[PDB]
Every structure is written in structure tokens, then in C-alpha cells.
């Protein structure tokens, strides 16, 4: 069986090699440069005692949720800086948070291996745990709402699952990874999603079928961060190699790599602008670099954090960028 | 230029801030500890006072200690160890009786000690089951020289043979700790029996010294 695997793997390598007639940079060589981009901190959100691990924007583009080591989940009003809610968490170790597309619910995850869904809008006027989802044998690295009922999670079990929150049991499990799944991103159409793992491979997943469509391998080390291009035909990865790579679903291969000899720190986060021309990456070097997605030329730097940047998010309308960090402050950039 | 509803929202935000500050001030008082031992080390048996993560609380001299034990993960710990870089200290428990496991224990200690995130954190090393170690050394059926040739030619700086063996085993870990030489973090070695009246006291003294060194560095005395 192993010998048969090599032939099919060799067939795949020839298939993607044959398609690479032109390079992305060759195609977009005659495109006007975006030039230097400058953004300044419009708002600095204070109130988190300890380091911030994760954040997520609401679809209304004004509210965001953040999770921190101090054991609190806080919903902010970005425009006015006010705190809408502050949720006490049973476990102080929280690796991820999510905000529902409707905004009625938020979710949580961490080393306790349980995903806790919170009901923001309720009679009696307090946030309460609607459901605690159990069934993962490892820490939850990420969680994202498809809708109010359904939520996908990724774990250190090397498995991802689709949960029905009303029933509280998994409806599908995704088992392709050979390492802890660090990140996931949902396609805009929601019919499919990607996952990144310490295996250093990214696999396209079909939510309805429960199978892996494609697998992408270009990273030497773990893939910390994953994001889908706004069109949905491509996605961008972040790893500990201090390089980001753009992959294309249809071509099934790499288009462009965003690497600079100056920087050696790993990429903690990646995000895309609304147009997709800009790729924003968060590093352990206490700063975020803005890349021209087409030309892979650095267009700017966002440096205001005294510690590493845990999370990075771009608003749905694309007006603002929010970056959390281990110094316990979130900054809105514009 | 703020509506009444916006003013009420701001007052609610300020009340939330006050409650968060109170909770943080309450949380600061406890000293947080991390307990790491691969297996057969008696890491649960170290402290007599008491699925993803196990938490233990013991109090000594009106000081609250939090000890976390993460046992639901694989042998590799690179990802979840990032969270525990704010801890006061890391408690490493190793069974000195089993000589075959000692090389793996030394490799684990080196990996923890040289981890980038845990560079600031000091370690408290409990060499455990010293009574079983002494019994094996007196019996002599198991030879330390076979596993580590250095013991066959060693001199000390409880029987003398047992003392030499225990000093040798301690010296390996102390040398791995000394190899860094940074001084920001120090390894405090101790020898613990299977049942010991006081280990929270030792942890308390080591945490007192750990905090004292940080105080000296902050006050620019060093």
C-alpha cells in the first residue's frame, strides 16, 4: 500500500507542476503599486487585567469580543470604547472566542477541552452559558459560528467537529490532520472551510460531506494562522517560519510567498483587507506588517504594542483593524 | 453632546471596570505554580494538603498557592506551555529511583529550561523516591555506572554511597540549569521521600526567594 501511495503522490506533484505555467508576480508585474500605507490608532481599549489571547468582530462592525488570561470575556463598543458585557469564565485558560453572525451568542474555548456558548440577549438581563459542548479529547484552538445553531471547532486532538448546539452532539468529524489543529477559517459561502495544523499542512474541508477535498503543503513548521481570501478562491497561511503563503483552491498550489530576510519571528495571525489587496500579519516581533497581496512587497508597519500580538481582525465593512496583544490592550487602527 | 442613553451606557461601563478591577486585585494575591512530571514521579503525592487541567489549592502561612497539572495532552507540550509563562515557578518532579528513565527526564528538564517562553520562570526540582533509590543502591543489583559511566569515577564535594549517588543525580540537573547562566531564573533542587511532612513549606521558601530576587532586580539593588 505504501508503494501505491508514492505513485499517487508523485502523480499529484506532476499535476500541480504542470499547471504552474506562470507565476503570480509575473502576471501582476504591470500593476500600479499601492505605495506606503499609514494607519494610526484611533482607539485603545483598556480593562483587561492580563494578556489577551483572542478577539473577534461582530458582523454589525461596531462590537467585538475578547478573551484574556484574567478569565474574563468582555464585549466592547468600538466607537465609544464602552464595555457592553463582562462575562466571568470558569477556566482562566482560554485560547479562542467567537461572535455569532446574528450577534445573539458568543463562544469560548481553551485547555478545558469544552466549548461554552453564551447567550447574550435574554430576559433577566445577564449573560448565561446556553450550552457546553463536550467530546474533544484535546484543547480547542479555534471555533467559528456557521449560524446560530451550528459551530465548527478545531482541537489538539488533530480533529475538527461540527456541532449542533441545540442537540449538543457532533454531527460530523474531520479526521485528516496528523498534528494539533491550530486554526481554521470559514469560507464566505460557508459551504467549506480550511484548517491549519502543526503537521504544517492545510486541508480544504467540505462541511456538508465531511471529507477533505484538497491538501496544501508548503510550510516547514506549524501553521499558526489561516484566513480565506474575500473571493473565497484563495487563502493565506501563517507559520513559525516567519513566512506567509497564499494558496489557490482551483490551481491547488501556491501562488505567492510573503517572506523578508529582516524578520525571523513567527506569524501569530493573518487577515485580509476587504479588497484582498492587503494582507495583515501579526508577529512575535511585537509589530504587524502590511503586505501587498499581489506583489508581496511590504507596504507598512503597525507598531504600538509592548508585547506580541495574539490576534488580528479586520472589520466586515473594512473600516478598521483591531489587534490584541499580550500587554493587555487592543488597538483599533484605521 | 452625549445622549441620556449614552451617558447611562458609560456609567454601566464604569461599573463594569470597577468590578473587573476588584476581581483582578483579588486574583493578584495568589501565587500560581505549574507542576510537570511525565509519569511515575509521584507529582500528585508531592503535596499532602490536596478533564483538561487539574487544579490544586494549598495554604501555608496564610499564603494561597495554585498548582496546575495538565495531564490530558500528549508528551509534547510546546503549545499549551505558552500560557504558563506568568507563573511564579515550575515544579518538576522526577523519580530518581528509575535510572533508565533518568536520561529522558534530563532531556525533558533541558527542553523546559531552554524554552523561550519559560526563560524568566524559575524551577523547583523535587527528586522523589529517595528511599527507594537508597534501597536500590544498598542492594547493588542495579548499577548506576552502567547507565552513567561518570558515577564510577566520582567523589562527593545516610550511607556515603547513597550520598554520592544522590549528589550525582542532583548534579546532572543542576549542571543543566547552570549551563544557561542567565541568572534571570534559578533551579532549586530538593530531595523528597514518598511521604514527607513538609513540601509546601519548601515550595513556600523557594517562592519567597524567587520573589525576593525579582524585588532586588526591580529596586536596582542588583
Amino acid at each position: 500500500l505504501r508503494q501505491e501511495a508514492e505513485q499517487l503522490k508523485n502523480q499529484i506533484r506532476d499535476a500541480r507542476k504542470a499547471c504552474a505555467d506562470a507565476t503570480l508576480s509575473q502576471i501582476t508585474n504591470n500593476i500600479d503599486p499601492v505605495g506606503r500605507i499609514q494607519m494610526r490608532t484611533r482607539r485603545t481599549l483598556r480593562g483587561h487585567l492580563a494578556k489577551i489571547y483572542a478577539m473577534h468582530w461582530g458582523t454589525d462592525s461596531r462590537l467585538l469580543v475578547s478573551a484574556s488570561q484574567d478569565g474574563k470575556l468582555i464585549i466592547w463598543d468600538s466607537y465609544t470604547t464602552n464595555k457592553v458585557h463582562a462575562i466571568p469564565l470558569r477556566s482562566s485558560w482560554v485560547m479562542t472566542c467567537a461572535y455569532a453572525p446574528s450577534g445573539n451568542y458568543v463562544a469560548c474555548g481553551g485547555l478545558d477541552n469544552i466549548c461554552s456558548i453564551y447567550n447574550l440577549k435574554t430576559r433577566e438581563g445577564n449573560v448565561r452559558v446556553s450550552r457546553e459542548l463536550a467530546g474533544h479529547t484535546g484543547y480547542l484552538s479555534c471555533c467559528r459560528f456557521l449560524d446560530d445553531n451550528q459551530i465548527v471547532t478545531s482541537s489538539g486532538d488533530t480533529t475538527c467537529a461540527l456541532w449542533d448546539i441545540e442537540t449538543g452532539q457532533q454531527t460530523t468529524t474531520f479526521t485528516g490532520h496528523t498534528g494539533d489543529v491550530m486554526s481554521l477559517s470559514l469560507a464566505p459561502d460557508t459551504r467549506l472551510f480550511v484548517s491549519g495544523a502543526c503537521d504544517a499542512s492545510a486541508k480544504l474541508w467540505d462541511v456538508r460531506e465531511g471529507m477533505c477535498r484538497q491538501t496544501f503543503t508548503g510550510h516547514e513548521s506549524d501553521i499558526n494562522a489561516i484566513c480565506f481570501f474575500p473571493n473565497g478562491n484563495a487563502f493565506a497561511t501563517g507559520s513559525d517560519d516567519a513566512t506567509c503563503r497564499l494558496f489557490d483552491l482551483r490551481a491547488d498550489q501556491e501562488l505567492m510567498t510573503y517572506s523578508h530576510d529582516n524578520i525571523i519571528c513567527g506569524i501569530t495571525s493573518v487577515s485580509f483587507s476587504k479588497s484582498g489587496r492587503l494582507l495583515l500579519a501579526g508577529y512575535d516581533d511585537f509589530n504587524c506588517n502590511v503586505w501587498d497581496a499581489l506583489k508581496a512587497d511590504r507596504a507598512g508597519v503597525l507598531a504600538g504594542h509592548d508585547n506580541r500580538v495574539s490576534c488580528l481582525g479586520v472589520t466586515d465593512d473594512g473600516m478598521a483593524v483591531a489587534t490584541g496583544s499580550w500587554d493587555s490592550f487592543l488597538k483599533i487602527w484605521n | 453632546t452625549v445622549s441620556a442613553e449614552d451617558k447611562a451606557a458609560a456609567e454601566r461601563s464604569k461599573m463594569i471596570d470597577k468590578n473587573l478591577r476588584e476581581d483582578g486585585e483579588k486574583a493578584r494575591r495568589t501565587l500560581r505554580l505549574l507542576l510537570l512530571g511525565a509519569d511515575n514521579s509521584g507529582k500528585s503525592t508531592i503535596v499532602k494538603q490536596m478533564s483538561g487541567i487539574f487544579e490544586t489549592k494549598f495554604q501555608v502561612d496564610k499564603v494561597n498557592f495554585h498548582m496546575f497539572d495538565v495531564g490530558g495532552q500528549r508528551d509534547e507540550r510546546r503549545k499549551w506551555i505558552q500560557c504558563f509563562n506568568d507563573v511564579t515557578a515550575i515544579i518538576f518532579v522526577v523519580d530518581s529511583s528509575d535510572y533508565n528513565r533518568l536520561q529522558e527526564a534530563l532531556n525533558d528538564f533541558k527542553s523546559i529550561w531552554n524554552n523561550r517562553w519559560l526563560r524568566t520562570i524559575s524551577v523547583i526540582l523535587f527528586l522523589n523516591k529517595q528511599d527507594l533509590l537508597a534501597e536500590k543502591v544498598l542492594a547493588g543489583k542495579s548499577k548506576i555506572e552502567d547507565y552513567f559511566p561518570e558515577f564510577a569515577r566520582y567523589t562527593t564535594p545516610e550511607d556515603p554511597r547513597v550520598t554520592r549517588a544522590k549528589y550525582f543525580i542532583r548534579k546532572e540537573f543542576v549542571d543543566i540549569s547552570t549551563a544557561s547562566g542567565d541568572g534571570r531564573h534559578i533551579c532549586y533542587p530538593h530531595f523528597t521521600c514518598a511521604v514527607d511532612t513538609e513540601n509546601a513549606r519548601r515550595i513556600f521558601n523557594d517562592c519567597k526567594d524567587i520573589i525576593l530576587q525579582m524585588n532586588l532586580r526591580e529596586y536596582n539593588l542588583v
Epitope: 461596531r62 462590537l63 463598543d77 465609544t80 464602552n82 457592553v84 458585557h85 430576559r123 433577566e124 438581563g125 445577564n126 | 453632546t1 445622549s3 441620556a4 442613553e5 449614552d6 451617558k7 447611562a8 451606557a9 456609567e11 454601566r12 461599573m15
Partner: single-chain antibody, 228 residues
Amino acid sequence: VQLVESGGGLVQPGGSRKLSCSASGFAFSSFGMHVRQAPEKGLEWVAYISSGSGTIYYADTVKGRFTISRDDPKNTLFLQMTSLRSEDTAMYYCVRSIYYYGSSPFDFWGQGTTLTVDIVMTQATSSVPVTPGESVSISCRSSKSLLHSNGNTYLYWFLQRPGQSPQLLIYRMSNLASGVPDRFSGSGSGTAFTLTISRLEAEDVGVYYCMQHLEYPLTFGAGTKLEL
């Protein structure tokens, strides 16, 4: 959730009476608490006590006479009333209101207890003839524009059915309060607002009050009564 008012009955002029509303089933500390209806007049807002009692407001009619206080652990709100006059006779309502981005204040009202002893909001028609199954429209106006710079227009619509407390229908002129059928809609422009009911049915008959929350004191309209 429940708010049960206590105290009332006959009081001589110049006497003092304490009215208390006891809260059960909701987090009393988080909510700010507030309203009286005269025997033959629309609603009038008496006093407000914020969460934590940090902020207090009174109507100019009752300022210097009434005092509003909350004892959070027992979940009770008090109104200490002094120098009662003939005008003070009314039915007093205990109302809860929570203020954050997207909250629906004035959502729940108490039953109320009878006692026997500035933006001008105007409703055009005191009574409007209606028929079952026929769409109707209700109009209210503001002396001053209720649209704030931040973009929210602070207009609220309440419904008081016969023998029942007012119920919130629409908050901030467009949002529909939870538990309300979709038929109700709020279309509004600055200084002029309206409520539209489509497929009107029985049990939706009552006085429709328009309120402004732009600034204190809170003013209620006279209200428009619907009868089949």
C-alpha cells in the same frame, strides 16, 4: 420576571406615604429603575434611579418632595413621598430599563398601585376609528428633533390595553421589542414619526403612547385610543 407594587390607599393632603415595588426573576442590580398615570390622563415620568444609585433624576413637579431609593440585596425599589397634594393621585408603575449598545429600555412594567389623595410630544388624534383586519396608522410629533448626532433617534411606542400596564412595542423609532408581532413597524423622520399596524386584530386595541428619551425629563404623548 415580575414587579409587584405595594402601598397606596387613602392619604390625607400633607401626609407621607412610601411606595415599594419588589423585583423577582431578574438581576435587579444591573437594571436602572424608573412613571405614574393619573385617573383620567396619560402617563407622566416621576423619577429615575440608576444602577448602583449613582444618578437620580426627578420631574420638576415632584422635585424636592419625593425621594427614590433602591435596596439591592432585598431587590426592592422605594419612593418616599412627602407633602402630598391632590395632583399626586395616580397609578404608580415600577419600570425597569437597562442601557447599553442595543438594549431595549422600558421593556417591562409593573402592575401598579393606586393612590388617592422640555420636549413636547403631541398625538394628533385622541381617538381613531378602526375595523378588524384593516391596517391603521398612528402619528406622533416632537417639538424638537429627536435625531441625535450619533444617529439614533430616541422615540418609543407603548401600548396600554384596558386594565393592563403599558407594554413596549418599538424602541428608537425602528427596532421592534422582543415578544411583539412583526405587524408593528416604526417609520419616522426628524420631528415627525408614525406607527403602522398591518392586519389589525382584536387584543391590539388600546392607547398608544409616544415617548422621547433624548433628554430628561421624559415626556409622554397624550395617546391615541383604538376601538373596533
